[PDB]
């Protein structure tokens, strides 16, 4: 299964994924393709924020969904 990621360069990339891939594995693939380390990434799907630990299957992310990638800070 292939999904899309709207990246931090204003572009859109593709990733080969499996619904059993965890969000941190998706972040590792996004680091593979773009370089941003996974600890600085926040994945958003249609408003819902994706957390490391649960897979794409748990969020019911579809055939060719598109995840927004946002820069991640720590604080409040």
């Amino acid at each position: 299964m292939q999904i899309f990621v709207k990246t931090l360069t204003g572009k859109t990339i593709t990733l080969e994924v499996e619904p059993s891939d965890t969000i941190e594995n998706v972040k590792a693939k996004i680091q593979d393709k773009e370089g941003i380390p996974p600890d600085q990434q926040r994945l958003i799907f249609a408003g819902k924020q994706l957390e490391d630990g649960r897979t794409l299957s748990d969020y019911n992310i579809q055939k060719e969904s598109t995840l927004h990638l946002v820069l991640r800070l720590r604080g409040g």
Binding site: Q2, K11, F45, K63, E64, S65, T66
Partner: protein
């Protein structure tokens, strides 16, 4: 009104299936479809299919960014609504005021041109959320398929080709049609840098499959900004020209007669890259003379033909600005349609299996 909407035979099958699904309680309308239905006195079963497609087309908002702002679930438009809306094209006669150049490269026509625009929504391969109906139609495990894309663009373009063939036939002329890089912009999404030859091949396929069905379409001037080699091609009787405005400078504008055509021998027709959910103007309803849609809708009297109001052409900005009665009191055309309650609804026809445009109920039999 001054515009007309054409849809394909398979689009009418889509509409028939969606209507008989909504009648059986098997599906549920989207939000905007429901808002437009609420103003209607009739139910889904009372109205004919023409009123159904009219209320579905009326759901389009004047200004929409389909590449991100659409959820494709129930929040705005269900996927069936989207697969129907993408195949609907709208044509209208226009007064072309400049050559249609982008930014500040436009050149004002000294005597404005009389021609025709044909807004056809390109393939939508971009979304801010879930997959689009076009994504499911033309993609096979994320790989672009040229055959399904050919079928899509044929479905969406052939009705306008038939209409303008008949128009040139009735005008004792032939048809010179300018086509841009439809769907090669934001609509391409991740396929931004592979889509150009796919669109070119889809166009060549449509032309060569129906060369004899279009006897009076003579010149076809196709111009993606870049990404394609300049070329001429013979397709039966018609000359198909790939002339990238960015590669070969001096190319005729989108709202300008191609080389070898003139108002005595050809009618000028321009295909405009539309979207699934906006009015013919899109960006220019918000005031922007940007993108193919916006530049063409702003450089012509599109907003006049859609709203019925008489606007003024600003030569300095190359714009069809709203009427003085409104502007004298930053207020764009979307402001006009909001303040005057103007909607987008017009006559609709379908392309028969034989190849003749007719009313929806007629061809549905």
């Amino acid at each position: 009104m001054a515009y007309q909407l054409l849809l394909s035979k398979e689009t009418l099958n889509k509409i028939l299936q969606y209507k008989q699904n909504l009648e059986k309680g098997l599906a549920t309308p989207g939000k905007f479809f429901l808002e437009e239905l609420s103003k209607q006195e009739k139910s889904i079963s009372e109205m004919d299919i023409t009123t159904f497609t009219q209320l579905l087309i009326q759901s389009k908002k004047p200004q929409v960014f389909a590449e991100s702002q659409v959820y494709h679930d129930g929040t705005d438009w269900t996927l069936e609504e989207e697969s129907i809306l993408g195949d609907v094209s709208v044509n209208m006669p226009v007064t072309m005021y400049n050559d249609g150049g982008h930014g500040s490269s436009f050149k004002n026509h000294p005597k404005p041109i009389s021609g025709y625009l044909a807004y056809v929504p390109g393939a939508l391969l971009a979304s801010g959320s879930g997959p689009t109906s076009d994504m499911k139609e033309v993609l096979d495990n994320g790989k672009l398929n040229q055959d399904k894309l050919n079928a899509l663009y044929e479905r969406r373009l052939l009705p306008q080709l038939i209409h303008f063939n008949e128009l040139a036939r009735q005008n004792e002329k032939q048809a010179a049609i300018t086509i841009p890089g439809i769907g090669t912009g934001a609509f391409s999404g991740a396929y931004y840098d592979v889509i150009k030859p796919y669109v070119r091949n889809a166009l060549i396929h449509i032309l060569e499959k129906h060369k004899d069905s279009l006897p009076y379409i003579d010149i076809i001037h196709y111009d993606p900004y870049m990404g394609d080699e300049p070329a001429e091609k013979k397709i039966g009787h018609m000359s198909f020209r790939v002339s990238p405005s960015g590669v070969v400078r001096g190319t005729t504008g989108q709202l300008d007669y191609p080389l070898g055509s003139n108002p005595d021998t050809h009618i000028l027709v321009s295909i405009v890259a539309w979207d699934h959910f906006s009015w013919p103007g899109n960006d220019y309803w918000g005031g922007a003379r940007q993108t193919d849609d916006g530049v063409k809708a702003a450089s012509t009297d599109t907003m006049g033909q859609v709203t019925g109001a008489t606007g003024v052409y600003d030569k300095k900005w190359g714009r069809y600005m709203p009427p003085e009665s409104f502007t004298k009191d930053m207020s764009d055309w979307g402001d006009y349609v909001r303040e005057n309650g103007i909607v987008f609804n017009g006559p609709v026809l379908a392309l028969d299996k034989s190849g003749k445009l007719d009313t929806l109920e007629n061809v549905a039999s």
